[PDB]
Amino acid sequence: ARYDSLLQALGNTPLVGLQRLSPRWDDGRDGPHVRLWAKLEDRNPTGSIKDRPAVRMIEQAEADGLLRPGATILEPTSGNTGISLAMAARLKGYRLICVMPENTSVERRQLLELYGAQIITAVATAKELAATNPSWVMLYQYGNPANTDSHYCGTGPELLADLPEITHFVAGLGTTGTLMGTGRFLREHVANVKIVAAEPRYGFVPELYDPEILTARYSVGAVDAVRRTRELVHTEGIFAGISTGAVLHAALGVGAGALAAGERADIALVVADAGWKYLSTGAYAGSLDDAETAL
């Protein structure tokens, strides 16, 4: 565990059994086990899963000759990808400018500046800004196969190593990188694997998306998401972000499926970031209806 740079202290995230919240942790008289396992991607340099594609997208753009020393990077995001890229650019000697509206909160804005980024439909605006300079590159996490590659070459191998007996992989669907990359890999090695997606109730379709890979899709409501998140910290001591709530809700559906049909299940689910940056929204305390409108 000795790294000459933070960029290497990346991935190799733990997988943790959720014994209290699993439908059936122990095999028994009433049937085989139905287990949830949690992949803690919040144990990453910036505390989110986006550290994986961020570093990969920079290394690929280098390899394709787009990125020369002292160059400048551009991307549409004011969230987790922004943070990740800013960390990674700073360390690779690059300059960053992120792509967001004025509307975007003071919290998100100041966090990016703290990491050293600079501040500026939004996908299109960005493409135009890259077309301004030869040394200005736009990585495009929504289209970039390096996003999908980072999970193919990291996340999937780690899961399979920790959980050879895996039956399902559940994860949030945003850029689609996680599900595409991890699902492509898991299918190759575990033929019977099911790849389940969790998403918000209502946008665009990413170039990375391939529908064949998914077995199922769950549309999750705010109240459900929040409730699950809260259950997850109350019961398991894991303080996750809101997308984990959605993922967990979907994973409990799947799990209830296996339990009803008397089958084994080992369900791996992605904890993509922690609850720290969602705390200011009150959503962890008070009523769930307060929390729903407060999001």
Ligand X SMILES: O=C(Nc1cccc(-c2ccccc2)c1)Nc1ccc(C(=O)O)c(O)c1
Ligand Y SMILES: *Cc1c(COP(=O)(O)O)cnc(C)c1O
Question: Which amino acid, one-letter code, is at 138?
Answer: M
The binding track of 165-204 with respect to a second copy, each residue x by CB under 8 A or -, is: ----------------------------------------
Kindly tell me which residue out of 23, 45, 76, 177 binds ligand Y, with binding defined by CB under 6 A: 177
CB atoms within 10 A of CB 31: 16
Question: Which amino acid, one-letter code, is at 176?
Answer: T
Q: Which one, of 164, 168, 160, lies nearest residue 264 by Cα? A: 168
CA 1 to chain CA mean position, Å = 24
- DSSP class of residue 146 equals H
149 binds, among a second copy, ligand X, ligand Y, none (CB under 5 to 8 A by kind): none
d(CA 127, CA 162): 40
Q: Give CA torsion, residues 44, 50, 52, 54, to 10 deg.
A: -120
The binding track of 243-282 with respect to ligand Y, each residue x by CB under 6 A or -, is: x----------------------------xx---------
d(CA 137, CA 117): 15
The binding track of 12-51 with respect to a second copy, each residue x by CB under 8 A or -, is: xxxxxx-x-----------------x--x--x-xxx----
17 is in an annotated binding site: no
241 binds, among ligand Y, ligand X, a second copy, none (CB under 5 to 8 A by kind): ligand Y
101 binds, among a second copy, ligand X, ligand Y, none (CB under 5 to 8 A by kind): none
N residues, the chain: 295
244 is in an annotated binding site: no
Show contacts with a second copy in window 226-245 (CB under 8 A). Answer: 230, 233-239
